[PDB]
A paper describes a structure:
Ribulose-1,5-bisphosphate carboxylase-oxygenase ([name]) is not only one such enzyme where biological function is predicated upon oligomeric state but is also capable of adopting multiple assemblies. In particular, representatives of form II RuBisCOs have been shown to assemble as either dimers or hexamers, in which the hexamers are composed of base dimers arranged in D3 symmetry. Here, we investigate the diversity and evolutionary trajectory of oligomerization in form II RuBisCOs, revealing a trend of structural plasticity that underlies the interconversion between, and innovation of, multiple oligomeric states.
In contrast, the dimer-hexamer clade displays several dimeric enzymes interspersed between hexamers, highlighting the structural plasticity of form II RuBisCOs in this clade. Thus, we used a more rigorous modeling and scoring protocol within Rosetta to screen 128 combinations of different interface residue mutants, with a total of seven residue substitutions (K98R, A134R, T148R, G151E, G281Q, T282Q, and G358Q) introduced into the I. peregrinum sequence based on the top candidate. Of the seven substitutions, the R98, R148, and Q282 residue identities were also present in the hexameric sequence conservation analysis conducted previously, while the remainder was unique to the BRH_c57 enzyme. A hexameric assembly was captured and verified by comparison of its SAXS scattering data with the BRH_c57 hexamer, but a second dimeric state was also present in the purified sample.
Author numbering:
A (entry chain D): 2 to 453
B (entry chain C): 1 to 454
C (entry chain H): 93 to 184
Amino acid sequence: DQSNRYANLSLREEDLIAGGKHVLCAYIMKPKAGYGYLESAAHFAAESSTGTNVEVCTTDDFTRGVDALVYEIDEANELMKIAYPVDLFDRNIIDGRAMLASFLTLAIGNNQGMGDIEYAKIHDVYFPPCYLRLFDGPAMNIVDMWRVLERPLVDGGMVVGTIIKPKLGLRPEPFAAACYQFWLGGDFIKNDEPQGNQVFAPLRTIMPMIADSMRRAQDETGQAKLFSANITADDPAEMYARGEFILETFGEFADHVAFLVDGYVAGPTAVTACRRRFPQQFLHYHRAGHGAVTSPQSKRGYTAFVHCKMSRLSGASGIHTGTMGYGKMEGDADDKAIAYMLEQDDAQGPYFRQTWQGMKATTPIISGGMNALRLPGFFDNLGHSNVIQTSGGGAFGHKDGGAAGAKSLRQASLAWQQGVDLLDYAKEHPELAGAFESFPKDADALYPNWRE
Amino acid sequence: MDQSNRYANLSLREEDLIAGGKHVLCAYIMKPKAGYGYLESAAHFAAESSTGTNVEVCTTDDFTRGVDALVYEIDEANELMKIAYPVDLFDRNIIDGRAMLASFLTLAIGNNQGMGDIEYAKIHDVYFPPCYLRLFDGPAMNIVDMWRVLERPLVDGGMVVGTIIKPKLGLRPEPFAAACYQFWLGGDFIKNDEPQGNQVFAPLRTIMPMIADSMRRAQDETGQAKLFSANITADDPAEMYARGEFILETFGEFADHVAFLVDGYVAGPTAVTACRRRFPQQFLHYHRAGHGAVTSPQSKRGYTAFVHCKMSRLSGASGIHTGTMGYGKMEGDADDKAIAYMLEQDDAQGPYFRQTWQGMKATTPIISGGMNALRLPGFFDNLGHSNVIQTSGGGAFGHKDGGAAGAKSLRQASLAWQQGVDLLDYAKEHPELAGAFESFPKDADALYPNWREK
Amino acid sequence: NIIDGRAMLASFLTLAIGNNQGMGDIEYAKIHDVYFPPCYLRLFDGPAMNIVDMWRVLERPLVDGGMVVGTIIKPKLGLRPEPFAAACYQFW
Ligand SMILES: O=C(O)[C@@](O)(COP(=O)(O)O)[C@H](O)[C@H](O)COP(=O)(O)O
Ligand SMILES: O=C(O)[C@@](O)(COP(=O)(O)O)[C@H](O)[C@H](O)COP(=O)(O)O
Ligand SMILES: [Mg+2]
Ligand SMILES: [Mg+2]
């Protein structure tokens, strides 16, 4: 029992916040059978800061000053809050900046394997100014795409995008062909998360072809076109080489290219590798694999809200927030709070209010089983459409091709921005009307009388 | 949309798929959500893990279908799902054509973990065929390199007696270096606790020269080489490189006594590979802090500890924490010994797949987590050998007589097991080991009830 | 740039105020204003930090944070390290 040392329930959360010297974390935790709640929380805090499972002869009074402390519990609700003194976290020797790997190592590291704990999951975290100030933060935003697209730099509207489908299998020539088609009616194309340098579609062969499709589509449409290329790799040198080659290839239009990183499976080190080597390129955070812990089915790790929040510290220009229940992946309408926390200077989490002291915003990237017919309902819940939207099947699954699917996705956006029913808007826009016939199951559910 | 006709081929024989050597096989424990058929859900699973989506797209061609991932076995009653991944699906480096673990994870355990029609899915085993396994870095060093520096036999050299500098955080540079010197008087190996680095109260540039001094002094008085494992984990690879370069420079003539520790689960495979490829001649100490978020048996998602450790060998970890197999404080079971065998043998058996490694270098298990002198004999009885790196933080500095005594007790206990001498009989003629019983009486009572009257 | 396609101020100077400053038939010429259209201005790096970053570190308001009280170490040259560091501490 280490409760006397690592537990101080007499501390008030409002004082700990006002002090600005603690990183607060709200966990949903349940001990194993035969273990008390507070005793378990104190051991949790010990193994997440300075302690072990026994007393050691090397502990001194200074060590006790940086102990993480349990300052609030609710056994009936399985709630536990721990305050981490900021001095616990690692710092770079090259520039003294903070690092996300240290926060994860402590707040959600060895404590996920303790035997006396059934589970524990982070649902919120408060970063004080002196800590948040040390993180890279985003360097670019959807604002940078709006600028290239010559759109309003505030409330510039939805960026009409897609994902090249098939996820894998398209050889270079058909790949660039599909890119050209979508860009005839769309703005943004991203690599599907695993596309890179497969033997049947080498990167050095496909990228010059994608650049040509961009140049052609730009000349025929008179509009700028954006791309997002996957550079994820185990070796940072491979990431750099991919980024360099892609920039030289796209040449004068290199500022039209975002860099995608599978940051959850590759890790924050991959994300920060791209963030610091290519700060002038839009960092597209793809969260493939996050569901292993973020799913509500899981009681361990951290929630999607916390995952996306930490991505703003790492410096993502945009990150996938999910369809918030309107797509094919797990999500809830209340996930709108994730978007607000990423784009605003002041927003509310499940437990903690967070100010960002002017740190740049991260743009929500909405994707996953979406199409023209599903966008109005999704935006009614979010409250605005100033997001990046990518619909793979929603565009190429269009019976009339990707170019019409792109136009249908755009038309769906304007229909919502102006408060016009999608069916009423579909009578004067064949591409949108074709989406209804392309996805009749969705049409029957969202607009029952569409055939008439 | 039922996609079983395309992504499901239950007529394929697993033995043929392994014989062909052209598919990565994965065995999942998967349960669909209510109202979704098992096979149709599994077909969708394979589609979102290879070439497909949730609707038909006009871009699909016959070539695409050729590289589809295929469900070749399902046991609905037992929630089993096996998928075969054509090796051509996975990404390759443009600089050297080598494989990357990030791509395998993106496909085999990426977006499929967020599908709304699946309740959960967890990988329990994976088979890598030769043509794919051959493309991974694999380990460059081993406990054999530690045995060589320690001037011990390079086969069955025995346990490396190690510890973790406790407190986990808070020890300033001077007491830190003092605890290091004391343990090395009786021990072999010291590792940073997983979060120790460049805290403002213990700067790296200040503490590292003191650790090297403690290493030098201990080596001079004991006439034995001493090892240290330094944490270099960071978000920025430039920081990782800077730390490694400074540490190697500081240790100078004893730079080969230093291992580099990387918190590979939270920092990711990119941090592990960054160290593996920049410092291939320094022992790579993979620390898995955070892994329990998926590997815990309580979790039905992600991958098991067995799968996590097996992949660490592909990334090139010289050693990784396999857990205490139920004999320590962390979660584990005695059957986790299969993890060690899969890491250190050229031919081992997994829960579903037998794996040969074609001479790829072994990864050494690291045993840690609430261990001490009393708990080691039972753990090695279950493993069958003591060729591991053992670190006991509380087991060493929790000794009533200090860290030095704790180190001797750990070594003495290991020798006791290696020569088949009961621990209590060994304590009769080794005071340091005897003190370990009094230091941890709750453990002495359980594992050696009659320790007091003897 | 061939490495990233960005603009370079050097090219602007070379053309707008380069060889034209040595012509024999011109007594003098001096730029008093210049307009950069969006498609050109958008290709420049632009500032990455501001006084806002200074206000943040000083824990001041990020809008209308006020004057940053500063000095230049004098003598311009000749202060050895010890007195130089002593002058720094005094002003801070
Ligand atoms: O492969 C996919 O599954 C997607 O392209 C959606 O496909 P479609 O749009 O083509 O149907 C998105 O990447 C995922 O939704 C990513 O997950 P999240 O948004 O949840 O990060
Ligand atoms: O912080 C800790 O808990 C440890 O230093 C153990 O300290 P003690 O020896 O004092 O218990 C190790 O990191 C864990 O053993 C890692 O767990 P695993 O090896 O299972 O990944
Ligand atoms: Mg995708
Ligand atoms: Mg540790």
